[PDB]
Structure 1
Amino acid sequence: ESRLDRILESGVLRVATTGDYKPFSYRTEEGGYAGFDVDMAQRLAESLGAKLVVVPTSWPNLMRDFADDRFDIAMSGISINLERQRQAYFSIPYLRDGKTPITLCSEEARFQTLEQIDQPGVTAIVNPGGTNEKFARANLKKARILVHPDNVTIFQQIVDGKADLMMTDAIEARLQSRLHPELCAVHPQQPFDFAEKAYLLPRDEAFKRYVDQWLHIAEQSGLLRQRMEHWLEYRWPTAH
């Protein structure tokens, strides 16, 4: 009894995703999904002769959903952290990263360091329930933290000037600044902290070992990096 076997038998892979996080997972205005981790999710399902079932979830509900067993694996640009390690397993990482700022191109110079950023006159905007929030709350003792529930729309807020910056994964900062010409990803090559992206798993060795092997291959074949770039340069809508 590994759910690897459950799945193989089933011919069905329940994959949890949020659909608010380009380029990993966006819910099209059709109602279907699209993104890197979705792409990758398909490939995984293919490799097990499983049909891809996509289960919607949200950062706030991720771990309730996990504990309720509402899915087999979570693929949605999920940052590895220990708070999560407490209940769930994690694949090997597929992306090294860390939090870095995105801001108005013009204003760039003013938001290079936490030091600058943690000032009373400053507003950081973040989406709720994930490492973005957790990281802001943990680090901003002086500035204001604005919580914007819809992550898709969140970056327009900066364009619109409703906030000064967001500190998110350097990859997302890279992407949004493509989609919002106004915005500028702040030293993404050199993020403020270190964290990884990996897929959230149940505590199931045999399954982890598989997912790892699968992912490890993809990585080393260059397929990972390849599809990664694809989805970055992909012609997304700007919000919805």
Structure 2
Amino acid sequence: ESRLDRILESGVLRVATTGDYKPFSYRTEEGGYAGFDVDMAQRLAESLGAKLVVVPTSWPNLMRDFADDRFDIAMSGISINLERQRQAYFSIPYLRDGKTPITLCSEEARFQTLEQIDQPGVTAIVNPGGTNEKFARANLKKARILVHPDNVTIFQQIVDGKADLMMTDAIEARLQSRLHPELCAVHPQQPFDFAEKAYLLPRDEAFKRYVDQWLHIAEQSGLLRQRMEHWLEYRWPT
């Protein structure tokens, strides 16, 4: 009665992914998938003699989808947080990060501190339902919060002047500062908070143990560092 045994008997691993967060997970117009976490899902599946079955989900529906048992694991640039820990498990962490501003490079100097960001005529854009929204709501008393449903296009909103900044994971701020030359990542090396990425798991001890063992070896063998570099350098569209 571990889903580790179910997966091993099945030969199927159901991996949920949002498809909306480069460099971790991106759903093409074709209807396939790329990125570091999709790449890693194929690896986890293989290690189990299993076929990778990609289950679409979204930031707003992640925990509903989780509660409903639509998937065995979620692999999608997911931050660890305690709200999520209330219901699910996380794997050991594969990345350390934190929220930081991305804004027009000209504006950069305005938005160094949350003191400067949280002001009556400032508009911070966020995608709904995840840690970006949570951070914005927890920390902005005075700035307006513009909820934009499509995270793939959220950075174009900043370019197009529809909002002054977004606070998002610094890895996403660094990459999008490359995909949209107008945008700058603000002190990505000194984020406003601490958070880790990990894989979202059922409350299942044996399956967490297997996943963590697989991830620890991927990490210590350097295979993890190398696939991330590959996906950071990859030719993402905009």
| Structure-1-length-normalised TM-score | 0.98
Q: State the SS of the aligned residue for 2:54.
A: strand
Q: Distance in 2 between matches of 1:207 and 1:192?
A: 33
Q: Aligned equivalents of 2:125 and 2:230: distance in 1?
A: 28
Deviations 1:35-72 (A, max 9, x none): 11000000000100100000000111111100100000
Deviations 1:150-169 (A, max 9, x none): 00000000101111100000
Task: Extract unaligned runs of 5+ from structure 1.
Answer: none
Aligned to 2:15: 15
Give 1:79 deviation, angstroms: 0.5
Q: Could you say what secondary structure the match of 2:29 adopts?
A: coil
SS in 2 for 1:106: coil
Structure 1 residue 213 displacement after superposition: 0.6
| DSSP 3-state at the match of 1:42 | helix
How far is the alpha carbon of 1:121 from its aligned partner? 1.2
SS of 2:59's equivalent in the other structure is coil
- 1-structure distance, mates of 2:20, 2:231: 15
Q: CA RMSD in A?
A: 0.5
Cα deviation digits, residues 105-156 of structure 1 (max 9, x gap): 1111110000100011101000000000000000000001000000000000
Q: CA–CA distance in 2 between the matches of 1:178 and 1:230? A: 15
Query: Deviation of residue 19 (structure 1)?
Result: 0.4
Partner of residue 39, structure 2: 39
Q: CA deviation at 1:96?
A: 0.4
Distance 2:154 2:189 in 1: 23
| Within-5 A mapping of 1:105-124 | 105-124=105-124
Q: Distance in 1 between matches of 2:221 and 2:113?
A: 37
Divergent runs of 4+, >6 A: none
Deviation at 1:8, TM superposition (A): 0.7
Structure 2: gaps of 5 or more residues: none
CA displacement at 1:233 relative to structure 2: 1.0
TM-superposition CA deviations, 1:72-102 (whole Å, max 9, x none): 0000000100101011000000000010000
SS at match of 1:188: coil
Report the alpha carbon displacement of residue 220 of structure 1 after superposing the two structures with TM.
Answer: 1.0
- 1:179-209 CA-to-partner distances (Å, cap 9, x unmatched) read 0001001111110000100000000111101
Percent of aligned positions that are identical = 100
TM-score (norm 2): 0.99
CA distance in 1, matches of 2:159, 2:67: 38
What residue number does 2:177 align with?
177
Q: Secondary structure at the match of 2:106?
A: helix
